[PDB]
């Protein structure tokens, strides 16, 4: 349903609010054959917005909206985190610093940890979020969103040393593992990003 200025009707230039080059890579495939140059903002010499937003779609269209005034580009930008359904969201937007001044992934699920320490065990649901956002313009009043989700539940111990943050804590049921213990095809076939994306292909095909 979305309208004009997404995909080039030659290539567009699409800026990427974000340094990270697997992610770039990851995209600028994925929507190159929709005619999308993805590139990353570092690349344009962008500094990172200051992320002021109390959800994952302020978050990311904020950043997607310092990228695109910068550059003068359209942008594509994300925002992601845990929340826990009995602690109201939380971690939420506070998901990579949740422990404060001198975060670390480590000290960070150990704090959901011990904040979860005597929720129930049928009370431990939780979900990955992952909001990305397509904006034609900084003033654009209509970005495409693509929220993508994935349920979990909360360990009480960490199992698994891949991906990454509170991985090592977010069981999985369907896998009867948690997510760090899933190797990273198997995690990105399932997770809130991979939904993101599945989203952002298919309202840019369709309408």
Not at 79 to 101: N, Q, W
Request: aromatic share 6%; with cysteine; charged share 25%.
């Amino acid at each position: 349903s979305s309208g004009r200025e997404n995909l080039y009707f030659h290539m567009q230039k699409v800026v990427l609010a974000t340094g990270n080059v697997g992610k770039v890579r990851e995209l600028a495939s994925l929507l190159s054959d929709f005619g999308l140059d993805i590139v990353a903002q570092t690349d344009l010499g962008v500094d990172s917005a200051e992320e002021t937003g109390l959800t994952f779609i302020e978050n990311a269209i904020l950043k997607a909206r310092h990228a695109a005034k910068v550059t003068a580009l359209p942008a594509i930008a994300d925002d992601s985190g845990l929340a826990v359904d009995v602690l109201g969201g939380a971690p939420g937007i506070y998901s990579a610093r949740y422990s404060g001044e001198d975060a670390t992934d480590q000290k960070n699920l150990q704090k959901l940890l011990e904040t979860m320490k005597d929720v129930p065990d049928d009370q431990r649901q939780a979900r990955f979020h992952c909001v990305l956002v397509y904006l034609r313009h900084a003033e654009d009043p209509t970005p495409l969103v693509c929220h993508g989700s994935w349920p979990g539940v909360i360990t009480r111990e960490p199992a698994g040393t891949g991906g990454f943050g509170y991985d090592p804590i977010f069981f999985v049921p369907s896998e009867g593992k948690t997510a760090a213990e899933l190797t990273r095809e198997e995690k990105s076939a399932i997770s809130h990003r991979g939904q993101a994306l599945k989203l952002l292909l298919d309202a840019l095909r369709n309408g």
